[PDB]
Ligand binder design. Sequence first.
Ligand code: NAI
Ligand code: NAI
Ligand code: OCS
Ligand code: OCS
Ligand code: ZN
Ligand code: ZN
Lengths: 436, 435
Amino acid sequence: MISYLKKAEKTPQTETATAQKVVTEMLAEIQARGKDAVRQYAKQLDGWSGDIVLTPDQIREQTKDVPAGVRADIDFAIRQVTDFALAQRESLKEFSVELHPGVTAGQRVLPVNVVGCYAPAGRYAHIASAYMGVATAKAAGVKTVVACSSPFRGQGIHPHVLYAFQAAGADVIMALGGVQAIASMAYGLFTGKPADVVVGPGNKFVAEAKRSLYGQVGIDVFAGPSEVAVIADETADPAIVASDLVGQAEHGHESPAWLFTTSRDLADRVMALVPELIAKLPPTARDAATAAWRDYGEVILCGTREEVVEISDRYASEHLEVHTADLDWWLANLTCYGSLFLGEETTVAFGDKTSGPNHVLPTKGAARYSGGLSVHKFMKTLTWQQMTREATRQIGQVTARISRLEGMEAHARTADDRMAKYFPNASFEMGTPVEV
Amino acid sequence: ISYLKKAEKTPQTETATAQKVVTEMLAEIQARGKDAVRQYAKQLDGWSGDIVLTPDQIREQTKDVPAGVRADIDFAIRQVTDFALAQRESLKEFSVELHPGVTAGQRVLPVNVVGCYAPAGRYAHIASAYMGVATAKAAGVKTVVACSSPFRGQGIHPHVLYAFQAAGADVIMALGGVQAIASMAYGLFTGKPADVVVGPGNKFVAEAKRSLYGQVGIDVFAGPSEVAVIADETADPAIVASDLVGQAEHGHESPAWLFTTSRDLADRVMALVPELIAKLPPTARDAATAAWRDYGEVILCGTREEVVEISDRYASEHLEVHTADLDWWLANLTCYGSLFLGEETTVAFGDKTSGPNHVLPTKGAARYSGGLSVHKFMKTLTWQQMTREATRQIGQVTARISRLEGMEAHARTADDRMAKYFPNASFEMGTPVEV
Ligand SMILES: NC(=O)C1=CN([C@@H]2O[C@H](COP(=O)(O)OP(=O)(O)OC[C@H]3O[C@@H](n4cnc5c(N)ncnc54)[C@H](O)[C@@H]3O)[C@@H](O)[C@H]2O)C=CC1
Ligand SMILES: NC(=O)C1=CN([C@@H]2O[C@H](COP(=O)(O)OP(=O)(O)OC[C@H]3O[C@@H](n4cnc5c(N)ncnc54)[C@H](O)[C@@H]3O)[C@@H](O)[C@H]2O)C=CC1
Ligand SMILES: N[C@@H](CS(=O)(=O)O)C(=O)O
Ligand SMILES: N[C@@H](CS(=O)(=O)O)C(=O)O
Ligand SMILES: [Zn+2]
Ligand SMILES: [Zn+2]
């Protein structure tokens, strides 16, 4: 038996209907009206009536005052993300194999042509998100990267976001936010370069827009309001656990922070500390985190490690920290999470900004079926095959027979035609011809 | 570049029709659950019986499937499995050191539950039944649920059923169409919602899967079958024409495309295709006549490079190459579902028994994905671990960037570690955020 010491009124699912209604209306307008609707939304939602595509010269002008120390930090983080991305790239190989004798089959691994990357800017300016998308796309060998971020605080793109996009290798940069940005990248509005894949994190509207546009484009994953889970035993430090939960709760009113523990004492101290830490935050963060903890935060006490694994796997958190003994066991036994942080020393914020692994990660249970943005999301794994004539003796008769069982005579005739051309003297059973 | 035959319709033509039906049906199933599904099954497919088949039913319904049939299906399952296991070996786990003391790695883990759909309407898709289930089993998925439409006012086609059973399905349901995809996504009738739903189908099936993405993962948008052939002057028109017709019989919406550098070849094929269609039995003849007329296209190009450009833009589900210098085509083509190099292999071989999966992207989805494979059932997740020493650099960069973004609570998680691990250290952690 599992005890909820803190139960949330709301979950990542609560706001689904609200997001869907807005996105349905906006995507309909943009499909009908194109750039006209996008310019309208940019003005009405973001107060923006400037040009949307930045020229190379505006990019230089807008970043000319970014200090050396800020550039050095962003450059370091880009290098870490690139290093890990290149290691991930090496993990997926091309190959060919012989199947039935004379049947050669293989796998080609090819980057997509055009990627659109979104970096959010609303409550905060997402400098790290800006290099997470673009640097990964460049590591994957994508030749055209289009990047968008929302106009921020009465100006255009945040200068540090813009520096990140430029340093990471973006080919085209647009001052454009939200659903209208996602849609513009999917349809190639303003650039004439429709994306093959659109990636990047955002609020519930951004995430729903990407989900809805799937099919028009590929995507990385459903990457909506941030979530954090911590697994802790009696070895954990409640002050650090509480700090880590509050860390992601500041993202917004809808960010869940989950604690799964085998220690009642830990649970109690964390529940006492989280409100105290929230109260010491500055206004924007305090507003977000107070609501998020109240409405979405949960604390679950479990009897055994196996019970913790079961609940953790069901929650399928974007981020999972593990502050326990015997970390090898947790790495071996946990199966549903976006990104795993083993031990107290690393933490979600480190992964968010500069550890290396991508931060763009599944939310709302998408970790049941996908990991996060990676080079893998920009590669197509395509198959090819080639046969000797000899291989077609077996392959062809099996194809003709199965085809005819299914009722597909024209399929069987492509096998009959090869058998008659290559082996006119053979007499295999090719199945009773279909008559209806 | 010149169109010798231009289609009135494309894969895009019927999108609105599909989306309207799917939106209505999903809204109804979300409201009324199993009852909505049982009603759709009755009205659409004539079905009143039990939806979940019992083991006794499965055995009873397959008891007369002959040895010769079983041997062919078993052979095809082996080829699909062999290629799937090769694909599974191509994606590895690893760990690496980044900044000194930072370890990061990739875990590759199968999903828990897969739902597989095998179509049955115009034809009964025996091969489709093992393409999904066998691949899921090769990936190490523990629970596989399989559905196929009640066929012609009776139950699941017995050979589709045999295929599901022999390929390793854990649960089999007699359920078709949108109501099948929805039932597997939501775990109706089994209590086991799928993590990933896969499999091909008509425009309604494919749209239902596209719509339910998010609730579940999917393989790919896999709608009405498409075929493209690239041919030069060395190609045999009789075989090209045959191959086009072969997939045209799938239904009235199936495009058959010919890209060639030889006007002679194009002309002979355009004469032959109608003649071959005319010789088909009634159901196929009806499908292929409409498909070729409405969706068939023939494009003449001046250079190989032009062919590549056009082929890549069409991004066909299946692409056959009947040319000299096949190495060049393998090296230069980039958008297709599955490639058939040389005259000897052909799409129907891939459909039934070559090995590589036939469940493939249509309507331009080959621009961003390959087909169903074990890779669609594996999650690639990341993990990391650090020494305390590593956090001196990582932590100060985190704190500074966080504060530049306006994220003070993020920075405090770094400040807290620095104060705990290195209480005498003094770093630039960034100006605290005040708004
Ligand atoms: N899953 C992941 O990996 C990550 C998720 N995130 C999440 O990204 C989110 C960022 O959210 P925001 O600050 O809002 O930035 P955002 O860039 O996602 O959204 C700002 C844009 O949304 C539009 N918008 C806002 N409310 C709207 C409404 N009612 N109707 C239509 N458009 C509307 C704005 O006008 C603007 O164009 C946070 O929830 C954060 O946790 C952040 C990083 C990574
Ligand atoms: N992309 C790929 O890899 C593959 C594609 N396919 C395609 O699969 C398709 C199979 O189509 P079908 O024979 O129809 O079998 P299906 O199993 O896809 O469709 C039959 C189901 O659809 C329902 N349905 C039919 N019309 C409907 C309507 N108007 N409204 C609501 N429900 C409706 C039926 O009642 C039944 O439940 C073909 O187009 C074939 O080319 C087949 C194999 C692989
Ligand atoms: N924690 C965010 C990343 S960031 O803090 O916005 O950089 C996420 O959900 O990945
Ligand atoms: N040609 C079908 C496969 S099958 O002929 O239905 O077996 C496809 O589109 O993949
Ligand atoms: Zn964060
Ligand atoms: Zn076929």
